[PDB]
Amino acid sequence: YQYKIQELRKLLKSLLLNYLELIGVLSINPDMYERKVENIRTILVNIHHLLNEYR
Amino acid sequence: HVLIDLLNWFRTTNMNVNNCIWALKSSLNSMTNAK
Amino acid sequence: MTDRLTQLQICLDQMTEQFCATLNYIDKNHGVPPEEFSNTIDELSTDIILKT
Amino acid sequence: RSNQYQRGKMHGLKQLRDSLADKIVDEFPELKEPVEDIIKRTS
């Protein structure tokens, strides 16, 4: 379970980092912003998967 | 055409920005369900 | 008492709502005075860090 | 007016991401290296 805990922590850190990079994309070149948006959602979706085994 | 070209380019930028804003609003409205 | 799993769901929902509100403020405010906008965004980022 | 709005929003977004990068470096030093790369990915 420690492996899942550390996976969740690194996934949260990567989610924050990708949110920062995506908002930077919106800042400079928003025309392709969606190219990252769904990507971030996938990580969020993975988080939901990480909840499923913890149920 | 010089003024016309600048005018059209600035208009294109303007409604491209407006369309980006509307797309952001639509994306949030759609994704609020998944929240 | 409130189960900590329900608290976790409430916290993640509040985090999602906070991100939505922050980006909505950014989208509808970019262009307000720069100083007030920067102060409000600093407050929002402090809120993001605390929620994290 | 549209051009001034564009320039003002560009300046606002630039300060937004500068401050966010600075604070992410501050409270999260371990993620400092990608953040600069993020700037390199954006700028």
Short mmCIF file of C-alpha atoms in Angstrom, two decimals:
data_model
loop_
_atom_site.label_atom_id
_atom_site.label_comp_id
_atom_site.label_asym_id
_atom_site.label_seq_id
_atom_site.Cartn_x
_atom_site.Cartn_y
_atom_site.Cartn_z
CA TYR A 1 0.00 0.00 0.00
CA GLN A 2 3.00 2.31 0.45
CA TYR A 3 3.61 1.90 -3.28
CA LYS A 4 0.09 3.15 -4.00
CA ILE A 5 0.56 6.02 -1.53
CA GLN A 6 3.79 7.18 -3.17
CA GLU A 7 2.26 6.71 -6.63
CA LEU A 8 -0.63 8.95 -5.59
CA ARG A 9 1.75 11.58 -4.20
CA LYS A 10 3.90 11.64 -7.34
CA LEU A 11 0.73 11.71 -9.47
CA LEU A 12 -0.56 14.71 -7.51
CA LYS A 13 2.78 16.50 -7.91
CA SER A 14 2.79 15.74 -11.65
CA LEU A 15 -0.83 16.92 -11.88
CA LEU A 16 0.11 20.26 -10.30
CA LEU A 17 3.12 20.53 -12.62
CA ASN A 18 0.99 19.77 -15.68
CA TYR A 19 -1.62 22.29 -14.53
CA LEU A 20 1.13 24.91 -14.36
CA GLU A 21 2.41 23.94 -17.81
CA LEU A 22 -1.12 23.98 -19.27
CA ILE A 23 -1.91 27.42 -17.86
CA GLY A 24 1.41 28.57 -19.32
CA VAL A 25 0.22 27.17 -22.65
CA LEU A 26 -2.98 29.19 -22.26
CA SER A 27 -0.77 32.20 -21.51
CA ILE A 28 1.52 32.01 -24.54
CA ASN A 29 -0.07 29.76 -27.21
CA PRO A 30 -3.66 28.97 -26.13
CA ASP A 31 -4.65 27.85 -29.65
CA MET A 32 -3.34 24.33 -28.92
CA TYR A 33 -4.22 24.39 -25.21
CA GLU A 34 -6.67 21.48 -25.48
CA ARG A 35 -3.73 19.33 -26.63
CA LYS A 36 -2.72 19.18 -22.96
CA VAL A 37 -6.13 19.57 -21.28
CA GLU A 38 -7.43 16.04 -21.86
CA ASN A 39 -3.93 14.77 -21.00
CA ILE A 40 -4.28 16.26 -17.51
CA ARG A 41 -7.75 14.73 -17.29
CA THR A 42 -6.25 11.31 -18.00
CA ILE A 43 -4.09 11.68 -14.90
CA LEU A 44 -7.21 12.71 -12.99
CA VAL A 45 -8.94 9.68 -14.52
CA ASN A 46 -5.99 7.56 -13.38
CA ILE A 47 -6.56 8.98 -9.89
CA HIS A 48 -10.08 7.55 -10.05
CA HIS A 49 -8.55 4.21 -11.03
CA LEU A 50 -6.24 4.56 -8.03
CA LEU A 51 -9.36 4.93 -5.90
CA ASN A 52 -10.94 1.78 -7.35
CA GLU A 53 -8.32 -0.58 -5.93
CA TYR A 54 -8.46 1.27 -2.60
CA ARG A 55 -12.21 0.60 -2.31
CA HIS B 1 -4.82 46.87 -48.71
CA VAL B 2 -2.16 47.71 -46.12
CA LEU B 3 -4.72 49.09 -43.68
CA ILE B 4 -7.13 46.39 -44.88
CA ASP B 5 -4.59 43.62 -44.23
CA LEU B 6 -3.76 44.91 -40.75
CA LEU B 7 -7.46 45.39 -40.07
CA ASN B 8 -8.39 41.84 -41.09
CA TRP B 9 -5.47 40.31 -39.18
CA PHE B 10 -6.43 42.16 -35.99
CA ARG B 11 -10.07 41.14 -36.43
CA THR B 12 -9.00 37.51 -36.87
CA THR B 13 -6.96 37.71 -33.67
CA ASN B 14 -9.92 39.28 -31.86
CA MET B 15 -12.53 36.67 -32.62
CA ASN B 16 -9.94 33.90 -32.26
CA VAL B 17 -9.44 35.12 -28.69
CA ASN B 18 -13.22 35.31 -28.23
CA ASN B 19 -13.64 31.77 -29.58
CA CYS B 20 -10.89 30.55 -27.24
CA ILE B 21 -12.72 32.14 -24.30
CA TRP B 22 -16.01 30.55 -25.36
CA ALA B 23 -14.30 27.17 -25.81
CA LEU B 24 -12.84 27.46 -22.30
CA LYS B 25 -16.29 28.23 -20.89
CA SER B 26 -17.83 25.29 -22.78
CA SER B 27 -15.05 22.97 -21.60
CA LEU B 28 -15.63 23.94 -17.97
CA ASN B 29 -19.40 23.54 -18.37
CA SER B 30 -18.94 20.07 -19.86
CA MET B 31 -16.29 18.95 -17.36
CA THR B 32 -18.18 20.16 -14.27
CA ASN B 33 -20.22 16.96 -14.61
CA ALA B 34 -17.05 14.86 -14.27
CA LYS B 35 -16.03 16.86 -11.16
CA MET C 1 -18.64 12.05 13.34
CA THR C 2 -17.65 12.39 9.68
CA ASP C 3 -15.73 9.57 8.00
CA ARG C 4 -12.39 10.69 6.59
CA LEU C 5 -13.23 9.20 3.18
CA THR C 6 -16.22 11.53 2.91
CA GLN C 7 -13.93 14.36 4.02
CA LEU C 8 -11.49 13.35 1.27
CA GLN C 9 -14.24 13.47 -1.36
CA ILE C 10 -15.38 16.87 -0.06
CA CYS C 11 -11.78 18.12 -0.16
CA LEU C 12 -11.21 16.96 -3.74
CA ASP C 13 -14.53 18.45 -4.86
CA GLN C 14 -13.62 21.75 -3.19
CA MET C 15 -10.21 21.62 -4.88
CA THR C 16 -11.82 21.10 -8.29
CA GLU C 17 -14.28 23.94 -7.63
CA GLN C 18 -11.42 26.20 -6.53
CA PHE C 19 -9.47 25.50 -9.72
CA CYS C 20 -12.59 26.17 -11.79
CA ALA C 21 -13.20 29.47 -9.99
CA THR C 22 -9.55 30.53 -10.29
CA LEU C 23 -9.41 29.83 -14.02
CA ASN C 24 -12.79 31.54 -14.52
CA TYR C 25 -11.43 34.62 -12.73
CA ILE C 26 -8.33 34.48 -14.94
CA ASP C 27 -10.42 34.17 -18.12
CA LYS C 28 -12.88 36.94 -17.20
CA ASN C 29 -10.28 39.29 -15.67
CA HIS C 30 -7.25 39.15 -18.00
CA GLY C 31 -6.62 42.45 -19.77
CA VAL C 32 -8.85 45.10 -13.80
CA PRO C 33 -5.79 46.92 -12.44
CA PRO C 34 -2.60 44.83 -12.55
CA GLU C 35 -1.88 45.30 -8.83
CA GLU C 36 -5.32 44.21 -7.60
CA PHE C 37 -5.34 41.33 -10.10
CA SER C 38 -1.89 40.19 -8.92
CA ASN C 39 -2.92 40.40 -5.26
CA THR C 40 -6.11 38.41 -5.88
CA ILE C 41 -4.16 35.78 -7.82
CA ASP C 42 -1.59 35.55 -5.03
CA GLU C 43 -4.47 34.91 -2.62
CA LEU C 44 -5.87 32.26 -4.99
CA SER C 45 -2.47 30.57 -5.30
CA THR C 46 -2.11 30.55 -1.51
CA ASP C 47 -5.55 28.91 -1.43
CA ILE C 48 -4.33 26.34 -3.97
CA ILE C 49 -1.26 25.56 -1.86
CA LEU C 50 -3.29 25.25 1.34
CA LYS C 51 -5.87 22.99 -0.32
CA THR C 52 -3.00 20.84 -1.57
CA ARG D 1 -9.16 48.44 -27.95
CA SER D 2 -8.84 44.75 -28.86
CA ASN D 3 -5.07 45.10 -29.26
CA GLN D 4 -4.76 46.86 -25.89
CA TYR D 5 -6.86 44.11 -24.30
CA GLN D 6 -4.58 41.51 -25.90
CA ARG D 7 -1.43 43.22 -24.62
CA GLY D 8 -2.84 43.70 -21.12
CA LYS D 9 -3.98 40.09 -20.89
CA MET D 10 -0.59 38.91 -22.17
CA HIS D 11 1.16 40.93 -19.45
CA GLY D 12 -1.27 39.62 -16.85
CA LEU D 13 -0.76 36.00 -17.91
CA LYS D 14 3.02 36.50 -17.95
CA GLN D 15 3.00 37.79 -14.37
CA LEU D 16 0.60 34.99 -13.39
CA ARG D 17 2.87 32.22 -14.60
CA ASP D 18 6.02 33.96 -13.33
CA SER D 19 4.56 34.17 -9.81
CA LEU D 20 3.23 30.61 -10.00
CA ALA D 21 6.62 29.28 -11.13
CA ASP D 22 8.36 31.22 -8.36
CA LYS D 23 6.08 29.87 -5.64
CA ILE D 24 6.14 26.31 -7.00
CA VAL D 25 9.93 26.50 -6.84
CA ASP D 26 9.73 27.97 -3.32
CA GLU D 27 7.45 25.45 -1.59
CA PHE D 28 8.35 22.56 -3.96
CA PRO D 29 12.10 22.70 -4.71
CA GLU D 30 12.10 19.11 -5.99
CA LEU D 31 9.86 20.19 -8.89
CA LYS D 32 11.98 23.28 -9.62
CA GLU D 33 13.85 21.71 -12.54
CA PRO D 34 10.80 20.81 -14.70
CA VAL D 35 9.17 24.19 -14.01
CA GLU D 36 12.02 26.05 -15.71
CA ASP D 37 11.76 23.54 -18.55
CA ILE D 38 8.05 24.40 -18.59
CA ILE D 39 9.13 27.98 -19.25
CA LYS D 40 11.43 26.61 -21.96
CA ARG D 41 8.41 24.67 -23.21
CA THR D 42 6.32 27.87 -23.24
CA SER D 43 8.80 30.69 -23.92
#
